[PDB]
Amino acid sequence: EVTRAEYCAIACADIFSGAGEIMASPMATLPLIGARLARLTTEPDLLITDGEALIFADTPAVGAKAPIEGWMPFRKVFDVVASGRRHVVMGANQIDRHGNQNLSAFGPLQQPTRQMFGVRGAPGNTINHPTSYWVGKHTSRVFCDTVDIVSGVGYDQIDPENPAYRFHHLHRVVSNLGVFDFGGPDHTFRALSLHPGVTADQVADNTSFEVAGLADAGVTREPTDEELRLIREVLDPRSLRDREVSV
Amino acid sequence: EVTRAEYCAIACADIFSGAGEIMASPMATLPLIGARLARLTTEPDLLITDGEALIFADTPAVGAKAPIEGWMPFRKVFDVVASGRRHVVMGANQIDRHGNQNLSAFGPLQQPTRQMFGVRGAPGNTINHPTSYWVGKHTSRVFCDTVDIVSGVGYDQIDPENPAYRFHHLHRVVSNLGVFDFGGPDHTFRALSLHPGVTADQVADNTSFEVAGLADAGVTREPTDEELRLIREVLDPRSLRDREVSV
Amino acid sequence: VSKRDKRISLDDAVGELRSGMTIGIGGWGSRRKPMALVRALLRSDVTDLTVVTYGGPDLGLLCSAGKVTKAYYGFVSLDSAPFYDPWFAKARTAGEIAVREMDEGMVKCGLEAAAARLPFLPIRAGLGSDVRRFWGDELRTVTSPYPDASGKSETLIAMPALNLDAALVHLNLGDKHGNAAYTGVDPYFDDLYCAAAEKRFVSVERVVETEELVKTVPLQNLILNRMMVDGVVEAPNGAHFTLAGDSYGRDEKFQRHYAESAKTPQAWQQFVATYLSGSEDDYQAAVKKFAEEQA
Amino acid sequence: VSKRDKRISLDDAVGELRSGMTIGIGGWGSRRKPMALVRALLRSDVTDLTVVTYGGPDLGLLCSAGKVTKAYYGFVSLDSAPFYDPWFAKARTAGEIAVREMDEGMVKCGLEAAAARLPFLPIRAGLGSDVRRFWGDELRTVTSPYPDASGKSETLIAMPALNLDAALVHLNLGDKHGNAAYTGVDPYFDDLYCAAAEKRFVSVERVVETEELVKTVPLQNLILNRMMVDGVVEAPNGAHFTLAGDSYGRDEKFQRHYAESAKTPQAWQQFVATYLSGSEDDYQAAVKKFAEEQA
Ligand SMILES: C[C@@H]1CCC(O)=C(C(=O)SCCNC(=O)CCNC(=O)[C@H](O)C(C)(C)COP(=O)(O)OP(=O)(O)OC[C@H]2O[C@@H](n3cnc4c(N)ncnc43)[C@H](O)[C@@H]2OP(=O)(O)O)[C@@]12CCC(=O)O2
Ligand SMILES: C[C@@H]1CCC(O)=C(C(=O)SCCNC(=O)CCNC(=O)[C@H](O)C(C)(C)COP(=O)(O)OP(=O)(O)OC[C@H]2O[C@@H](n3cnc4c(N)ncnc43)[C@H](O)[C@@H]2OP(=O)(O)O)[C@@]12CCC(=O)O2
């Protein structure tokens, strides 16, 4: 028996399949478990940090310390961003059909109706290196037709005549309902798999726009026995993952 | 009785008069004695280094260590250069009437007749902050009509329409014969003082171009008793200064 | 004779600031903010400020006093629940401040341009995002004079220099001349804030003699030299309630109380009466009393 | 499973290089140059190189073997008498190399542009100097899109990115994965050389396990991480005859012998026969014998 959060964990690990020797920067608990799971199975050369300034040598449990292998203060993170050698998994208050993302605020730019973080590193992340998103509660308020403020750059912003845009790449969106990318026609939001027990109607009813390939999307793969052991015993023995994954 | 090298030492100290809280960067023994002499008398807020990577707290004798107050590795020197908060005293293989300077090579750029250092930091120094020169043997081969390679920027290179040039300032040239600046008409090489025993004819015979104000130039000031004590007892007890000052 | 003695009080330092200044504030979010200097700003009549910051409760407290006209920032965060600073949020939803929100890497870039006395530096971050709409014509592009191999020329954001009238930073140790060090895992960007500014004030946990400073920390931790500092303030616990490297962590309980007190007129008058209506010593005594009461 | 084991020999590392490459060489003048890697280049047939460096005897030895077609450098110096490197001087006076000589700050700037994948960075250094004549149309200007306060727009040097096919650097300590540290007072620019390059080779005095590395040096000394290195070479005394931080100083006597031996065909054949006609171990044994004989 595999829980919804465990499917989300292996989907978040799969984000990093083939990533090689780059900095994995997950910004929420499930992507964090996923990145560390990938590092312990098929992507050992990933770099990971303690979320503050230390690069870990070994892969620790959620919230644990581990021996270190290097230094990564915030000023040097911006060097990594500009180098391209990174894959970030951010959260999102809004994501539209072409991948524009908002974590800044709702409403007008100079007088919002609700304030969040501001754009943070989302513009630099999305223009420099692979970016993926995690959404713990897949709803039509998150997956909307138009984001209020573009903090993360989507595919309809790209100027193909200007090579400054050539590093943009939105890899995956993983939610509590399934695995998605922007491989639909015109770089539109596309279903790759639905977690076991999730129906196409459930995704459609909770997405404001049409999801490409939804009717034909298969089911998310089973975790291996090793992956279940690593999730349940090594990385997240307290099941902190369950707190983040809605229904 | 005051030696020629002692007049040169106080002239090199006077380079830094009014410099305030900036990095003094002398590149030869006499300017080094001068900078440290200034720091011990009327410019205590000067920053000085050990010539490698350490900022000195106290002012040591030539070649001596002293307690430190900060770190100044080469990469951070370029930050200081760009900040403008520095006054360098360089040497020179050639200096022309408008202050163009060469320490790179003689002859054609791509096939010189004699190779020296290349331009080093001279272009960045002369475009960013006060720059002065030390010449231990004042001759017509140094003070020439045209330098072979412009490593240090002179006054006839300045574009007054482009504010990128607004920090250029050549403060003094000190030689074994006297003290000079570029305050003559059209920013030309001008005599401020001649060291005791030096005649105008001696300067004229050893400079390829006419020296402004030469006939009216007074004699270099006497060192104070304190300055002589600091030079002879504290900063340069082995008289290393004598080795650099010709006749 | 002697190098300049730069030791001054908190109120002296703010006495050098003027309404209408552009002020950079060091630290990051709820991390090593010069909170004692910010509280001294609150006691003063200095207002109409343009603030450049990686924002946290420093910007929140300034907004609680209506002291901010314009803000340049990469983010605003308390780094712990509820994450969003409630006073910054109120100023935003009321339209009380004009914002030049930008990518976090653009703040670093802009400070670096000012430090080098350059009018701009090129950067990719910002392209294709609503950072362009926050800035309008204040943010322009620049095209490379060198095409790429394919023959296409890149057009990048021209990040303008973030020149500052003043910088306020807090560090762990320093001497009376402005040499100063951080202890802990991150310098943040405090050296860049100082290098970008005309008037530079550093508060430190403890003022020591130069020789004690340089024997206490590695060379690489000596991030301010004397050319980067105009005034030095001795302010123990002067980053409270933000964290401060090896000196102390974040006062999470007190930060939560600050954030909750912003919710109503009533709760804020009481917070102000208890913590912000006297001196730094009064604040420190009240904070200590809070920690004892809430154990 | 396991992180990649990047340990390789000197000749393996040079086996990854190709004639015609643009190669950056770390260190500075006669300071922590990857001299063992340079000697391995001399033993190889790799030639027609474009070299980017703060030049010292590394560039001299490459010029002695005719391996340099084009050189980008801020200076060339032995840092001790006779200061000018005699093999670089011979190549220059013979017109054997095309030079893009530049201000020292421009080298740093160009490496920084490449590290950030930018086509250029603006810089003041170079303006008004014969750096413009060394480069011709390869060095262009860029005008600020923001005029200064007076209404005049600044036109600056657009320093192009110094993109490298490979980088060779020497450091004091590292692990088998490419984490590496300097010990001593200056990192020079070795991190920037690696960040600007496609293929990165670091020689180190000693290879240790990761945990020993991070317990031996402060955090700030860990200047290479695993994303910055493709091959690790264990080369004790591998910077000889340049200095190497806390490991050793410059072999001043031997550097003087190198410089004197360049003066005549005769003296150089003997230097080559004794020091450069065998392996790194042969070189190290011969250098030790020289020091004993010259006491
Ligand atoms: C240094 C580097 C630099 C580079 C880099 O990479 C970094 C970054 O940092 S890059 C930033 C990465 N950071 C993220 O990825 C954070 C993403 N954010 C989250 O993950 C959130 O946690 C969340 C999205 C999951 C939930 O957030 P949320 O709580 O705000 O939203 P939500 O719960 O949905 O409720 C929404 C509420 O609004 C209500 N509403 C909806 N419409 C409206 C409307 N029109 N008007 C008014 N209200 C509205 C709705 O009724 C709910 O109200 P209410 O509930 O009814 O009251 C680094 C790394 C380390 C560092 O330091 O920098
Ligand atoms: C990191 C920072 C970066 C920023 C910064 O700021 C730095 C710098 O570093 S910034 C560089 C500062 N550095 C200097 O300022 C050095 C200046 N140089 C000197 O000071 C020299 O020492 C000298 C000038 C006094 C004498 O040099 P010299 O010996 O070459 O000349 P000279 O003796 O006159 O003989 C001349 C011989 O040529 C012969 N000849 C004359 N015409 C010709 C001709 N047409 N062709 C062929 N030959 C000729 C003549 O017959 C003589 O031949 P010969 O004698 O007959 O054989 C830092 C700081 C620390 C660091 O690391 O970087």
Short mmCIF file of N, CA and C in Angstrom, two decimals, chain C residues 115-237:
data_model
loop_
_atom_site.label_atom_id
_atom_site.label_comp_id
_atom_site.label_asym_id
_atom_site.label_seq_id
_atom_site.Cartn_x
_atom_site.Cartn_y
_atom_site.Cartn_z
N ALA C 115 28.96 50.12 -6.30
CA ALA C 115 30.27 49.94 -5.69
C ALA C 115 31.40 50.26 -6.67
N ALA C 116 31.22 49.91 -7.94
CA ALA C 116 32.22 50.16 -8.98
C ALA C 116 32.03 51.50 -9.68
N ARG C 117 31.08 52.32 -9.21
CA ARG C 117 30.81 53.63 -9.81
C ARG C 117 30.41 53.51 -11.28
N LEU C 118 29.76 52.38 -11.65
CA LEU C 118 29.25 52.19 -12.99
C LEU C 118 27.78 52.57 -13.06
N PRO C 119 27.30 53.05 -14.21
CA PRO C 119 25.87 53.41 -14.31
C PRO C 119 24.95 52.21 -14.42
N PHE C 120 25.45 51.05 -14.84
CA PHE C 120 24.63 49.86 -14.95
C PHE C 120 25.54 48.64 -14.98
N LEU C 121 24.93 47.47 -14.75
CA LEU C 121 25.54 46.20 -15.12
C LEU C 121 24.48 45.35 -15.83
N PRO C 122 24.87 44.59 -16.84
CA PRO C 122 23.90 43.75 -17.54
C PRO C 122 23.59 42.50 -16.74
N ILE C 123 22.35 42.02 -16.88
CA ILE C 123 21.91 40.83 -16.16
C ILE C 123 20.76 40.22 -16.93
N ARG C 124 20.66 38.89 -16.88
CA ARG C 124 19.55 38.18 -17.51
C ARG C 124 18.27 38.30 -16.68
N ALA C 125 18.39 38.11 -15.36
CA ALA C 125 17.24 38.15 -14.46
C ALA C 125 16.41 39.40 -14.67
N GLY C 126 15.10 39.21 -14.76
CA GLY C 126 14.18 40.30 -15.02
C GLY C 126 13.52 40.18 -16.37
N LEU C 127 14.27 39.70 -17.36
CA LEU C 127 13.73 39.55 -18.71
C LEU C 127 12.49 38.67 -18.71
N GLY C 128 11.45 39.11 -19.41
CA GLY C 128 10.24 38.31 -19.56
C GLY C 128 9.32 38.29 -18.36
N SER C 129 9.65 39.01 -17.29
CA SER C 129 8.88 39.01 -16.06
C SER C 129 8.23 40.37 -15.81
N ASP C 130 7.34 40.39 -14.83
CA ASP C 130 6.71 41.66 -14.51
C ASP C 130 7.63 42.59 -13.73
N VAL C 131 8.89 42.22 -13.49
CA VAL C 131 9.84 43.22 -13.02
C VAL C 131 9.86 44.41 -13.97
N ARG C 132 9.71 44.16 -15.28
CA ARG C 132 9.65 45.27 -16.24
C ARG C 132 8.49 46.21 -15.95
N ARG C 133 7.34 45.66 -15.53
CA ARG C 133 6.15 46.47 -15.26
C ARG C 133 6.24 47.22 -13.93
N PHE C 134 6.94 46.65 -12.94
CA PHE C 134 7.17 47.37 -11.69
C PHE C 134 7.98 48.64 -11.94
N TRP C 135 8.95 48.58 -12.84
CA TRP C 135 9.89 49.68 -13.07
C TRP C 135 9.51 50.60 -14.22
N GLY C 136 8.80 50.10 -15.23
CA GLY C 136 8.54 50.93 -16.40
C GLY C 136 9.83 51.41 -17.03
N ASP C 137 9.87 52.69 -17.41
CA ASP C 137 11.03 53.20 -18.13
C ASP C 137 12.24 53.44 -17.23
N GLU C 138 12.11 53.25 -15.91
CA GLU C 138 13.28 53.31 -15.05
C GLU C 138 14.20 52.11 -15.26
N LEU C 139 13.70 51.04 -15.87
CA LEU C 139 14.51 49.85 -16.15
C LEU C 139 14.56 49.65 -17.65
N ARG C 140 15.75 49.82 -18.23
CA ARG C 140 15.96 49.70 -19.66
C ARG C 140 16.83 48.49 -19.96
N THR C 141 16.87 48.12 -21.24
CA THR C 141 17.74 47.05 -21.69
C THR C 141 19.00 47.61 -22.31
N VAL C 142 19.96 46.72 -22.52
CA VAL C 142 21.22 47.04 -23.19
C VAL C 142 21.56 45.87 -24.11
N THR C 143 21.96 46.18 -25.34
CA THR C 143 22.31 45.17 -26.32
C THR C 143 23.82 44.98 -26.38
N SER C 144 24.25 43.72 -26.41
CA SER C 144 25.66 43.41 -26.52
C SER C 144 26.24 43.97 -27.81
N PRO C 145 27.40 44.63 -27.78
CA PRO C 145 28.07 45.00 -29.03
C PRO C 145 28.70 43.81 -29.72
N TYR C 146 28.71 42.64 -29.09
CA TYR C 146 29.26 41.43 -29.68
C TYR C 146 28.12 40.46 -29.93
N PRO C 147 27.78 40.15 -31.18
CA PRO C 147 26.79 39.10 -31.42
C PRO C 147 27.31 37.76 -30.91
N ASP C 148 26.39 36.86 -30.60
CA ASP C 148 26.77 35.50 -30.30
C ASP C 148 27.27 34.81 -31.57
N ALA C 149 27.78 33.59 -31.42
CA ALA C 149 28.33 32.86 -32.55
C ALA C 149 27.35 32.78 -33.72
N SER C 150 26.06 32.56 -33.43
CA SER C 150 25.04 32.42 -34.46
C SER C 150 24.79 33.70 -35.24
N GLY C 151 25.30 34.83 -34.77
CA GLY C 151 25.05 36.10 -35.40
C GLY C 151 24.00 36.94 -34.71
N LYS C 152 23.34 36.41 -33.68
CA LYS C 152 22.31 37.14 -32.94
C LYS C 152 22.92 37.84 -31.74
N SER C 153 22.53 39.09 -31.52
CA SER C 153 23.00 39.86 -30.38
C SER C 153 22.04 39.75 -29.21
N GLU C 154 22.59 39.54 -28.02
CA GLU C 154 21.78 39.44 -26.82
C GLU C 154 21.39 40.82 -26.32
N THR C 155 20.13 40.95 -25.91
CA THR C 155 19.62 42.15 -25.26
C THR C 155 19.29 41.76 -23.82
N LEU C 156 19.91 42.44 -22.87
CA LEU C 156 19.85 42.09 -21.47
C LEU C 156 19.24 43.23 -20.68
N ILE C 157 18.83 42.93 -19.45
CA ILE C 157 18.46 44.01 -18.54
C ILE C 157 19.70 44.82 -18.22
N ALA C 158 19.58 46.15 -18.31
CA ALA C 158 20.61 47.05 -17.81
C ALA C 158 20.22 47.43 -16.40
N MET C 159 20.75 46.71 -15.42
CA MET C 159 20.41 47.01 -14.03
C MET C 159 21.08 48.30 -13.62
N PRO C 160 20.33 49.35 -13.27
CA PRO C 160 20.98 50.61 -12.90
C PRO C 160 21.65 50.50 -11.54
N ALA C 161 22.68 51.31 -11.33
CA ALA C 161 23.35 51.34 -10.04
C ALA C 161 22.38 51.73 -8.93
N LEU C 162 22.45 51.00 -7.82
CA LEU C 162 21.67 51.32 -6.62
C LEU C 162 22.53 52.17 -5.67
N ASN C 163 22.76 53.41 -6.10
CA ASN C 163 23.54 54.35 -5.31
C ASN C 163 22.75 54.72 -4.06
N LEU C 164 23.42 54.72 -2.91
CA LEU C 164 22.79 54.97 -1.63
C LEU C 164 23.34 56.24 -0.99
N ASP C 165 22.45 57.03 -0.38
CA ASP C 165 22.93 58.10 0.48
C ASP C 165 23.53 57.54 1.76
N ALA C 166 22.95 56.47 2.29
CA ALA C 166 23.46 55.86 3.51
C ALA C 166 23.24 54.36 3.49
N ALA C 167 24.04 53.67 4.30
CA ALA C 167 23.87 52.24 4.55
C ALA C 167 23.88 51.99 6.05
N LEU C 168 22.98 51.11 6.48
CA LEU C 168 22.92 50.65 7.87
C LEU C 168 23.15 49.14 7.85
N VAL C 169 24.20 48.68 8.54
CA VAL C 169 24.50 47.26 8.65
C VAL C 169 24.88 46.92 10.08
N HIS C 170 24.67 45.66 10.45
CA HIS C 170 25.01 45.12 11.75
C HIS C 170 25.95 43.94 11.59
N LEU C 171 27.05 43.94 12.34
CA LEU C 171 28.03 42.87 12.28
C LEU C 171 28.38 42.42 13.69
N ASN C 172 29.13 41.33 13.79
CA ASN C 172 29.35 40.69 15.08
C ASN C 172 30.47 41.33 15.89
N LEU C 173 31.51 41.84 15.23
CA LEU C 173 32.68 42.35 15.93
C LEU C 173 33.30 43.46 15.09
N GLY C 174 33.82 44.50 15.74
CA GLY C 174 34.51 45.54 14.99
C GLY C 174 35.40 46.37 15.89
N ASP C 175 36.26 47.19 15.28
CA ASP C 175 37.06 48.12 16.07
C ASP C 175 36.52 49.55 15.92
N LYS C 176 37.16 50.50 16.63
CA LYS C 176 36.63 51.85 16.63
C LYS C 176 36.88 52.59 15.33
N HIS C 177 37.61 51.98 14.39
CA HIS C 177 37.91 52.62 13.12
C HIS C 177 37.05 52.11 11.97
N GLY C 178 36.22 51.10 12.20
CA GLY C 178 35.36 50.57 11.15
C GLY C 178 35.78 49.24 10.58
N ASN C 179 36.97 48.72 10.91
CA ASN C 179 37.24 47.33 10.58
C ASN C 179 36.22 46.45 11.29
N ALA C 180 35.61 45.51 10.56
CA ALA C 180 34.53 44.75 11.16
C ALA C 180 34.40 43.38 10.50
N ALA C 181 33.84 42.43 11.24
CA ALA C 181 33.77 41.05 10.80
C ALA C 181 32.40 40.47 11.10
N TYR C 182 31.99 39.50 10.28
CA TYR C 182 30.89 38.61 10.61
C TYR C 182 31.43 37.30 11.18
N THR C 183 30.63 36.70 12.04
CA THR C 183 30.86 35.36 12.56
C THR C 183 29.62 34.54 12.26
N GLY C 184 29.81 33.34 11.77
CA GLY C 184 28.68 32.57 11.29
C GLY C 184 28.87 32.20 9.84
N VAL C 185 27.81 31.69 9.23
CA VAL C 185 27.95 31.03 7.93
C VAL C 185 27.74 31.96 6.74
N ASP C 186 27.30 33.20 6.95
CA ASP C 186 27.00 34.01 5.77
C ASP C 186 27.25 35.49 6.01
N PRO C 187 28.07 36.16 5.18
CA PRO C 187 28.21 37.62 5.29
C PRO C 187 27.00 38.40 4.78
N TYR C 188 26.04 37.73 4.13
CA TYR C 188 24.99 38.36 3.33
C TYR C 188 25.68 39.33 2.36
N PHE C 189 25.28 40.60 2.30
CA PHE C 189 25.77 41.54 1.29
C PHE C 189 26.19 42.85 1.94
N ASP C 190 26.54 42.82 3.23
CA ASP C 190 26.75 44.06 3.98
C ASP C 190 27.93 44.85 3.44
N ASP C 191 28.96 44.16 2.92
CA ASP C 191 30.07 44.88 2.30
C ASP C 191 29.61 45.65 1.07
N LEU C 192 28.71 45.05 0.28
CA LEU C 192 28.21 45.74 -0.91
C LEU C 192 27.35 46.95 -0.53
N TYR C 193 26.52 46.82 0.51
CA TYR C 193 25.74 47.98 0.95
C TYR C 193 26.66 49.13 1.33
N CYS C 194 27.72 48.84 2.08
CA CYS C 194 28.64 49.91 2.46
C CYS C 194 29.33 50.50 1.23
N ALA C 195 29.80 49.64 0.32
CA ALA C 195 30.51 50.15 -0.85
C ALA C 195 29.63 50.98 -1.77
N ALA C 196 28.31 50.78 -1.74
CA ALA C 196 27.36 51.49 -2.58
C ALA C 196 26.90 52.82 -1.98
N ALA C 197 27.32 53.13 -0.76
CA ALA C 197 26.74 54.23 0.00
C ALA C 197 27.74 55.37 0.21
N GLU C 198 27.18 56.56 0.44
CA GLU C 198 28.00 57.72 0.80
C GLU C 198 28.34 57.73 2.29
N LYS C 199 27.33 57.55 3.15
CA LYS C 199 27.49 57.54 4.60
C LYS C 199 27.21 56.14 5.13
N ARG C 200 28.15 55.57 5.89
CA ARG C 200 28.07 54.16 6.26
C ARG C 200 28.11 54.02 7.77
N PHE C 201 27.07 53.40 8.34
CA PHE C 201 27.01 53.17 9.77
C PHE C 201 26.91 51.68 10.03
N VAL C 202 27.81 51.17 10.86
CA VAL C 202 27.83 49.77 11.24
C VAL C 202 27.62 49.68 12.74
N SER C 203 26.59 48.95 13.16
CA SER C 203 26.49 48.56 14.55
C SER C 203 27.11 47.18 14.72
N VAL C 204 27.71 46.95 15.88
CA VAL C 204 28.40 45.69 16.15
C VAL C 204 28.04 45.21 17.55
N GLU C 205 28.07 43.89 17.75
CA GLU C 205 27.79 43.32 19.06
C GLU C 205 28.79 43.82 20.10
N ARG C 206 30.04 44.00 19.71
CA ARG C 206 31.09 44.38 20.62
C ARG C 206 32.18 45.09 19.83
N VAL C 207 32.67 46.20 20.39
CA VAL C 207 33.82 46.91 19.86
C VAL C 207 35.05 46.44 20.61
N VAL C 208 36.08 46.03 19.86
CA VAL C 208 37.33 45.51 20.41
C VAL C 208 38.48 46.26 19.76
N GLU C 209 39.68 46.09 20.31
CA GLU C 209 40.82 46.68 19.62
C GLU C 209 41.14 45.87 18.36
N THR C 210 41.78 46.56 17.41
CA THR C 210 42.05 45.96 16.10
C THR C 210 42.72 44.60 16.23
N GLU C 211 43.72 44.51 17.10
CA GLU C 211 44.47 43.26 17.22
C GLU C 211 43.59 42.14 17.75
N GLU C 212 42.67 42.44 18.67
CA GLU C 212 41.76 41.39 19.11
C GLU C 212 40.83 40.96 17.97
N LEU C 213 40.35 41.92 17.17
CA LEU C 213 39.49 41.59 16.04
C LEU C 213 40.17 40.60 15.10
N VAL C 214 41.40 40.91 14.68
CA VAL C 214 42.03 40.10 13.65
C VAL C 214 42.54 38.77 14.19
N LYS C 215 42.70 38.64 15.51
CA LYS C 215 43.05 37.34 16.07
C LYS C 215 41.83 36.47 16.37
N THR C 216 40.62 37.03 16.32
CA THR C 216 39.40 36.30 16.66
C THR C 216 38.78 35.60 15.47
N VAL C 217 38.95 36.14 14.27
CA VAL C 217 38.26 35.62 13.09
C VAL C 217 39.29 35.37 11.99
N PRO C 218 38.97 34.49 11.05
CA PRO C 218 39.84 34.33 9.87
C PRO C 218 39.86 35.61 9.04
N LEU C 219 40.93 35.74 8.25
CA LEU C 219 41.08 36.87 7.33
C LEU C 219 39.81 37.11 6.52
N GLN C 220 39.22 36.02 6.03
CA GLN C 220 38.13 36.13 5.07
C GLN C 220 36.88 36.72 5.69
N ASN C 221 36.80 36.75 7.01
CA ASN C 221 35.65 37.30 7.70
C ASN C 221 35.74 38.80 7.89
N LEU C 222 36.89 39.41 7.60
CA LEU C 222 37.08 40.85 7.78
C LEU C 222 36.51 41.57 6.56
N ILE C 223 35.19 41.72 6.54
CA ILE C 223 34.54 42.18 5.32
C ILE C 223 34.44 43.70 5.20
N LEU C 224 34.59 44.45 6.30
CA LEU C 224 34.67 45.91 6.21
C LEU C 224 36.06 46.37 6.61
N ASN C 225 36.65 47.25 5.79
CA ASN C 225 37.87 47.95 6.18
C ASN C 225 37.53 49.41 6.45
N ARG C 226 38.55 50.20 6.83
CA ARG C 226 38.26 51.55 7.30
C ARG C 226 37.70 52.46 6.21
N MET C 227 37.97 52.16 4.94
CA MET C 227 37.44 52.95 3.82
C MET C 227 35.97 52.73 3.59
N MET C 228 35.34 51.83 4.34
CA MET C 228 33.96 51.43 4.07
C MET C 228 32.99 51.85 5.16
N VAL C 229 33.46 52.59 6.17
CA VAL C 229 32.68 52.86 7.38
C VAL C 229 32.90 54.30 7.83
N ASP C 230 31.82 54.99 8.17
CA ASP C 230 31.95 56.33 8.73
C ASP C 230 31.60 56.43 10.20
N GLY C 231 30.74 55.55 10.70
CA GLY C 231 30.41 55.52 12.11
C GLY C 231 30.24 54.11 12.63
N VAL C 232 30.69 53.86 13.86
CA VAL C 232 30.65 52.56 14.51
C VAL C 232 29.82 52.68 15.78
N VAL C 233 28.80 51.83 15.92
CA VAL C 233 27.90 51.84 17.07
C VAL C 233 28.03 50.51 17.80
N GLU C 234 28.33 50.57 19.09
CA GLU C 234 28.34 49.35 19.90
C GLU C 234 26.91 49.06 20.36
N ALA C 235 26.35 47.95 19.89
CA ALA C 235 24.95 47.61 20.15
C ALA C 235 24.82 46.12 20.39
N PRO C 236 25.10 45.67 21.62
CA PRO C 236 24.88 44.26 21.95
C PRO C 236 23.42 43.87 21.80
N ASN C 237 23.20 42.69 21.22
CA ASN C 237 21.86 42.22 20.85
C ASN C 237 21.20 43.20 19.88
#
